[PDB]
Structures are given as structure tokens and as C-alpha cells.
Amino acid sequence: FNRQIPAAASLIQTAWRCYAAENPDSSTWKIYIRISQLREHHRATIKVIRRMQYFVAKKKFQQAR
Amino acid sequence: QLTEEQIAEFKEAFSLFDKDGDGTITTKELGTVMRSLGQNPTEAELQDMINEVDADGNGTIDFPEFLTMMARKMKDTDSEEEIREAFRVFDKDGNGYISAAELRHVMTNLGEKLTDEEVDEMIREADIDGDGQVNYEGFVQMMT
Numbered sequence: 001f002n003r004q005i006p007a008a009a010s011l012i013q014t015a016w017r018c019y020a021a022e023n024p025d026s027s028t029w030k031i032y033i034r035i036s037q038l039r040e041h042h043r044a045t046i047k048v049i050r051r052m053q054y055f056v057a058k059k060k061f062q063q064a065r
Numbered sequence: 066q067l068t069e070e071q072i073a074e075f076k077e078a079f080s081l082f083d084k085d086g087d088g089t090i091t092t093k094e095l096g097t098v099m100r101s102l103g104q105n106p107t108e109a110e111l112q113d114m115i116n117e118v119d120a121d122g123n124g125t126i127d128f129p130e131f132l133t134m135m136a137r138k139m140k141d142t143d144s145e146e147e148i149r150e151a152f153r154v155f156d157k158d159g160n161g162y163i164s165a166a167e168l169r170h171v172m173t174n175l176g177e178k179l180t181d182e183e184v185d186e187m188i189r190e191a192d193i194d195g196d197g198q199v200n201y202e203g204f205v206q207m208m209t
């Protein structure tokens with residue numbers, strides 16, 4: 001019943017995680033518990049992946065419309 | 066639009082995925098990076114991500130594609146309208162506002178499931194008046 005609900009939330013969530021990652025002291029950087037000390041090469045690949053996941057969540061929201 | 070330094074920063078980011086050095090990014094290389102961050106993607110997850118960036122459609126990502134994706138103005142490229150309609154799925158019947166408690170429920174328990182600390186940042190920055198009612202139209206602009 002309404003597939004738009006998950007796709008909508010995921011588009012908001014990915015868009016915000018993409019926006020929050022531009023702030024390097026954001027709480028969004030705490031979610032990687034498996035990384036001992038977060039270095040700059042982690043942050044560079046994290047921003048790329050988050051952008052990729054935003055474009056996917058955007059597509060799936062589009063498809064559910 | 067783009068500086069010479071941002072392009073160089075994107076070239077270094079491209080090199081971290083392109084472990085082989087052949088100038089393209091495969092689904093297997095993306096899966097290696099993501100697992101190094103504690104993620105556990107599946108082959109469809111990785112192929113979904115690659116298909117959104119692969120222009121030609123060969124299944125691989127070259128640096129022009131990578132740079133095109135990283136430089137997409139995801140603020141004016143008709144994105145604000147879709148995030149707005151995403152909020153409208155849960156909108157308080159037409160309102161244009163969303164309960165801070167309702168936003169926390171959707172952000173924490175649905176979709177990607179953000180952390181409780183992440184929702185605090187989102188609510189605090191989006192609750193301009195501090196009343197527990199966020200207008201997302203204004204929040205969308207802040208993100209963009």
C-alpha cells in the first residue's frame with residue numbers, strides 16, 4: 001500500500017546525507033562505526049558514494065510516480 | 066563553474082575507486098570501496114549506482130562520467146521539486162508543514178533509517194521557529 005512512502009523517505013534521507021556531508025563535523029560522519037579513525041580518503045569516497053545513492057533514490061522515487 | 070582545484074580533488078577521489086589504474090570504475094571496485102567503509106552492498110545495489118553515472122552504458126565509469134556526476138548542480142537541476150513532492154507524501158494534509166515528531170518517525174524508521182543523532186541535526190536546523198513544526202519548503206531551500 002503506497003510504494004511511494006519508502007522511496008520518498010529514501011530520497012529525503014539521501015539528499016540530506018549528501019548535504020550534511022559537506023559539513024565535516026556533522027553527526028552524519030558518526031555512522032561508520034567500523035572505521036577506527038576517519039581519515040580524509042574515507043571522506044572523499046564517502047561523498048562520492050552518497051552522491052551516487054542520492055541519484056539512485058531519486059530515480060526510484062521517480063519510477064514510483 | 067568548476068575550479069581547477071575541485072577538478073583535481075575529483076581526480077584524487079576517482080583514483081581511490083580506480084584501484085587497477087585503467088581509468089574506469091567497475092562494479093567490483095565500487096564494492097571493494099564500500100566494504101572498506103563497513104557497507105555490505107549487493108550486485109544490484111552496485112549496478113544501480115553505476116547505471117546512474119554511466120553515460121555511454123557500457124557498465125563502467127570513466128573520469129569524464131565521474132566528473133559529470135560530481136559536478137551536477139543538484140540544487141537547480143529540477144531537484145527541489147522532487148524533494149518537495151517527497152515531503153508531500155507525508156505532508157500534514159496540504160499543510161506544507163510536518164510535525165518534528167512525525168519527521169523523526171519517518172527518518173528513523175523508514176527508508177535508509179537515519180541515526181537519532183542525524184535526525185537531531187535535521188530537526189534542529191529545519192525548525193526555524195522552534196515550535197515542533199518544520200516547513201519543508203524552506204528546508205528544501207536550505208539543502209539546495
Ligand SMILES: [Ca+2]
Binds near residue numbers: 085086088090
Ligand atoms: Ca578500474
Ligand SMILES: [Ca+2]
Binds near residue numbers: 119121122124125126
Ligand atoms: Ca561508461
